[PDB]
């Protein structure tokens, strides 16, 4: 929702980076944003909800970015 | 109107040396003739007369050695607004043991060295430097 939570965004998802093997984090090479892997919709439906009700980061999921050379 | 008579005394000598008067006069009192007695033994005056019966007029015969007067500079420390008392070990050495300091102990008024050699101190009255 703001950039004041971006330090917690890398931290709380970094807190989630230690936990799951099949869950990676990337940072956008084109648009300065965080890219999040997973297994499916439901797997990442709950991880946003895992981050909100434990770490107060109300994450908002959108489609990343295209390169467009 | 004449709060400090002692400050009058030293300033009468101070201006007397500046104006090169041969002798400076003033009215006498008990303390007046005692302070002039200390300068008499020290050799800042030649001598004094204390003439009078009702208004005793202390005259002080001044002193010169060259065209420069004897008394270089003479101060006042125990002025009636900032009365200052010092102990025996805290007596001052005016002009670093060269000049003298009039100080009043309980056994009379004397120099700083005579009082320190007596083992007691008192009211430092003025700096004869």
């Amino acid at each position: 929702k703001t950039k004041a939570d971006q330090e917690k965004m890398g931290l709380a998802l970094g807190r989630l980076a230690k936990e799951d093997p099949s869950f990676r984090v990337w940072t956008d090479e084109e648009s300065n944003q965080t890219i999040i892997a997973g297994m499916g919709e439901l797997h990442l439906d709950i991880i946003v909800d895992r981050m909100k009700r434990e770490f107060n980061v109300e994450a908002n999921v959108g489609k990343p970015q295209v390169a467009y050379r | 109107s004449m709060q400090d008579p002692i400050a009058d005394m030293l300033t009468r000598i101070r201006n007397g040396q500046a104006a090169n008067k041969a002798a400076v006069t003033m009215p006498s009192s008990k303390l007046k003739v005692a302070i002039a007695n200390v300068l008499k033994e020290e050799g800042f005056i030649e001598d004094f007369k204390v003439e009078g019966d009702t208004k005793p007029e202390l005259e002080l015969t001044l002193k010169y050695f060259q065209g420069k007067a004897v008394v270089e500079s003479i101060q006042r420390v125990s002025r009636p607004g900032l009365r200052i008392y010092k102990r025996k070990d805290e007596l001052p050495k005016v002009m670093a043991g060269l000049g003298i300091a009039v100080v009043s102990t309980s056994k009379g008024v004397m120099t700083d060295r005579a009082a320190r050699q007596a083992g007691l101190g008192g009211e430092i009255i003025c700096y004869v430097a």
Binding site: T2, K3, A4, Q6, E7 | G81, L82
Partner: protein, 123 residues
């Protein structure tokens, strides 16, 4: 003078104010950095100096100077602030410390890199 007047009303200690009220005796302060722009210094020397308008942690919106050249600053960036007069700029009293948070290091500067936060080149 006249000592009994100093008894009745003593010596007023001439306390001074420090020129940097970022925070009450503090080395560095974290700010949010809104409104980055450029302004013009006064008459004896002219340029277009870079200035950020930062709201500090404890409220207290102030300005700060952007040292070096080529900063990747924007509308919102958590940065760090250290005090210092930028005399040629009127009313700018702080310096953003490059080597800190979202205000990154200067594009290669081999001389005096303790300020501007450039690392030592590899060898």
């Amino acid at each position: 003078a006249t000592v009994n007047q100093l008894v009745r009303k003593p010596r007023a200690r001439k306390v001074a104010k420090s020129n940097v009220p970022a925070l009450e005796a503090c080395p560095q302060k974290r700010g949010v950095c809104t409104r980055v722009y450029t302004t013009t210094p006064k008459k004896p020397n002219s340029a277009l100096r870079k200035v950020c308008r930062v709201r500090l942690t404890n409220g207290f919106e102030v300005t700060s100077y952007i040292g070096g050249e080529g900063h990747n600053l924007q509308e919102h960036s958590v940065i760090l602030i250290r005090g210092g007069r930028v005399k040629d700029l009127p009313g700018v009293r702080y310096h953003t410390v490059r080597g800190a948070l979202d205000c990154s290091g200067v594009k290669d500067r081999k001389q005096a890199r303790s300020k501007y936060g450039v690392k030592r080149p590899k060898a």
